[PDB]
Design an enzyme around this catalytic site. Structure first.
Site, PDB file in Angstrom:
ATOM      1  N   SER A 123       5.421   5.498   8.625  1.00  0.00           N
ATOM      2  CA  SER A 123       4.857   5.280   7.410  1.00  0.00           C
ATOM      3  C   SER A 123       5.960   5.344   6.323  1.00  0.00           C
ATOM      4  CB  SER A 123       3.648   6.162   7.049  1.00  0.00           C
ATOM      5  OG  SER A 123       3.264   5.872   5.701  1.00  0.00           O
ATOM      6  N   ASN A 171       5.032   6.063   3.247  1.00  0.00           N
ATOM      7  CA  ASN A 171       4.083   6.630   2.335  1.00  0.00           C
ATOM      8  C   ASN A 171       4.024   8.179   2.420  1.00  0.00           C
ATOM      9  OD1 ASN A 171       3.875   4.360   1.070  1.00  0.00           O
ATOM     10  ND2 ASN A 171       2.405   3.797   2.526  1.00  0.00           N
ATOM     11  N   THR A 172       4.675   9.023   3.329  1.00  0.00           N
ATOM     12  CA  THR A 172       4.707  10.540   3.583  1.00  0.00           C
ATOM     13  C   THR A 172       6.357  10.854   3.433  1.00  0.00           C
ATOM     14  OG1 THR A 172       4.552  11.033   5.626  1.00  0.00           O
ATOM     15  CG2 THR A 172       2.755  10.332   4.693  1.00  0.00           C
ATOM     16  N   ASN A 204       0.887  -1.135   0.057  1.00  0.00           N
ATOM     17  CA  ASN A 204      -0.068   0.008   0.104  1.00  0.00           C
ATOM     18  C   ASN A 204       0.694   1.319   0.150  1.00  0.00           C
ATOM     19  OD1 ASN A 204      -0.494   1.793   2.795  1.00  0.00           O
ATOM     20  ND2 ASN A 204       0.265  -0.238   3.379  1.00  0.00           N
ATOM     21  N   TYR A 213      -1.193   4.461   0.664  1.00  0.00           N
ATOM     22  CA  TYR A 213      -2.264   5.198   0.763  1.00  0.00           C
ATOM     23  C   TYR A 213      -2.103   6.887   1.181  1.00  0.00           C
ATOM     24  CZ  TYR A 213      -6.327   2.190   1.142  1.00  0.00           C
ATOM     25  OH  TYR A 213      -7.346   1.311   1.121  1.00  0.00           O
ATOM     26  N   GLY A 214      -0.744   6.890   1.810  1.00  0.00           N
ATOM     27  CA  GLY A 214      -0.352   8.347   1.979  1.00  0.00           C
ATOM     28  C   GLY A 214      -1.065   8.932   3.184  1.00  0.00           C
ATOM     29  N   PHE A 215      -1.819   8.296   4.131  1.00  0.00           N
ATOM     30  CA  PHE A 215      -2.368   8.813   5.498  1.00  0.00           C
ATOM     31  C   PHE A 215      -3.700   9.721   4.661  1.00  0.00           C
ATOM     32  CE2 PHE A 215       1.428   9.948   8.233  1.00  0.00           C
ATOM     33  CZ  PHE A 215       1.333   8.672   8.883  1.00  0.00           C
ATOM     34  N   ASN A 259       5.867  -1.206  11.387  1.00  0.00           N
ATOM     35  CA  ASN A 259       5.169  -0.993  10.201  1.00  0.00           C
ATOM     36  C   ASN A 259       5.524  -1.612   9.112  1.00  0.00           C
ATOM     37  OD1 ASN A 259       3.629   0.891   8.457  1.00  0.00           O
ATOM     38  ND2 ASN A 259       4.106   2.546  10.096  1.00  0.00           N
ATOM     39  N   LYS A 318       5.787   3.902  17.060  1.00  0.00           N
ATOM     40  CA  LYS A 318       5.690   2.923  15.892  1.00  0.00           C
ATOM     41  C   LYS A 318       6.821   3.175  14.836  1.00  0.00           C
ATOM     42  CE  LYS A 318       2.666   0.256  12.981  1.00  0.00           C
ATOM     43  NZ  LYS A 318       1.171  -0.077  12.430  1.00  0.00           N
TER      44      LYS A 318
END
Ligand SMILES: Cc1cc2nc3c(=O)[nH]c(=O)nc-3n(C[C@H](O)[C@H](O)[C@H](O)COP(=O)(O)O)c2cc1C
Ligand SMILES: CC(C)=CCC/C(C)=C/CC/C(C)=C/Cc1c(O)c2ccccc2oc1=O
Ligand SMILES: O=C(O)c1cc(=O)[nH]c(=O)[nH]1
EC number: 1.3.5.2
Length: 367
Positions: free
Chosen positions: A186, A188-189, A116, A118-120, A255, A226
């Site tokens: 994450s 993704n950011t 994934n 998603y980017g929050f 994560n 996390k």
């Protein structure tokens, strides 16, 4: 009979519906169905062997739903009905934001994995605050009954000051949470994972803890960080040092991974994003093992990554996790995986001579 609807879901229902629906649409429907209570209640009754006391709370069983399934706090009660011992919502960002453009989630069925990016995507703090307020007292009773709630905090894409984003999350959702998660992992950011560095993490967590400590006693959550599975040994040493220096209450390990382990077969293996599920499992377990040793077993760990069986859960517990979470397995096996993990875990605890989950925590380090 439990194995059972497990077979029906795993062999027929889930594969079929996954054949019909792209993973994002599937996820939305899953959240919807869960929130409406449309799934039948979980038959498995939790034995006393599965109870864990950690983070200032009683947990009826040690199997939680990982962050990302219920990003906006819409399905909390249905998740308890599914048999989870605790629920974590989020990540929630301060302002609403849409996340990355589609497509942004991919199944790798041959690997029992998901990627994934998603980017929050988040409804934002205000919307989630009101959603949790509408059931705050119900949650107070659930928590008292051994069913705690975690809230996972993220930061907005365009935010200049990361620490202020996390601070706002503490102020707004801290009062509604048994524990808060500072998600600095994450993939993704852009730039987020750099907040795991020693100096950035210390500054960020000092501020988070100051904000948390300013909350009234009854509304004062535990604070966990996390972390990624892709950290260097140096990064891990530094995190452990900051955690002990500041009195961080715990760690969530781990994560998703930006690594692509040799052997992935899924056609979509080279999609950008975080990889979850079976290929992450032992990488996550090893990270738990390392973090437990670096913190001398004194810092509670929630172990997550590739758990789909009692054995997977127990391996993380023995490596040092006090609690575990899953997400990706739910996407392949469906709701029956929750009872499956718990039943298998109980059986294995008995077989290996443990009185209960608590006796098994960190057991590998004492051999
Ligand atoms: C679709 C998807 C969305 C996720 N979103 C989040 C998130 O918003 N915040 C977070 O801390 N972790 C998030 N995760 C990571 C999970 O919480 C978990 O750490 C990871 O997937 C490993 O567990 P699993 O192998 O059981 O899925 C997400 C994972 C997936 C697959
Ligand atoms: C909570 C759950 C796994 C099932 C609830 C009931 C229901 C009717 C599910 C129908 C369809 C279905 C395709 C669910 C699986 C699913 C995904 O495939 C999926 C894939 C990637 C990321 C998140 C995902 O979330 C899912 O729930
Ligand atoms: O929103 C996401 O992209 C996301 C956040 C996170 O923490 N982990 C993940 O795998 N995805």
């Amino acid at each position: 009979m439990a194995t059972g609807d497990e077979r029906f879901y795993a062999e027929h229902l889930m594969p079929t519906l996954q054949g019909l629906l792209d993973p994002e649409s599937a996820h939305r429907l899953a959240v919807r169905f869960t929130s409406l209570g449309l799934l039948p209640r979980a038959r498995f009754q939790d034995s006393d062997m599965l109870e864990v006391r950690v983070l200032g709370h009683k947990f009826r069983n040690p199997v939680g739903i990982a962050a990302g399934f219920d990003k906006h706090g819409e399905a909390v009660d249905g998740l308890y009905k599914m048999g989870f011992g605790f629920v974590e919502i989020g990540s929630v960002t301060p302002k609403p934001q849409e996340g990355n453009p589609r497509p942004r989630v991919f199944r790798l069925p041959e690997d029992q994995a998901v990627i994934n990016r998603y980017g929050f995507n988040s409804h934002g703090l205000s919307v989630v605050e009101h959603r949790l307020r509408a059931r705050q007292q119900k949650q107070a009773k659930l928590t008292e009954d051994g069913l705690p709630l975690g809230v996972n905090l993220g930061k907005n894409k365009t935010s200049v000051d990361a620490a202020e984003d996390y601070a706002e999350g503490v102020r707004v959702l801290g009062p509604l949470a048994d524990y808060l998660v500072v998600n600095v992992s994450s993939p993704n950011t852009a730039g987020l994972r750099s907040l795991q560095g020693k100096a950035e993490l210390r500054r960020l967590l000092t501020k988070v803890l100051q904000e948390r400590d300013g909350l009234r006693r009854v509304h004062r959550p535990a604070v966990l960080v996390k972390i990624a599975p892709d950290l260097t040994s140096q990064d891990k040493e530094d995190i452990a040092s900051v955690v002990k220096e500041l009195g961080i209450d715990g760690l969530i390990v781990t994560n998703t991974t930006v690594s692509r382990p040799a052997g992935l077969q899924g056609a979509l293996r080279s999609e950008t994003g975080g990889l979850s599920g079976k290929p992450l499992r032992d990488l996550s377990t090893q990270t738990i093992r390392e973090m437990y040793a670096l913190t001398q077993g004194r810092v509670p760990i929630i172990g997550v990554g590739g758990v789909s069986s009692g054995q997977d859960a127990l391996e993380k517990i023995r490596a040092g996790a006090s609690l575990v979470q899953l997400y990706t397995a739910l996407t392949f096996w469906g709701p029956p995986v929750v009872g499956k993990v718990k039943r298998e875990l109980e059986a294995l605890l008995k077989e290996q001579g443990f009185g209960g989950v608590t006796d098994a925590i960190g057991a590998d380090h004492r051999r």
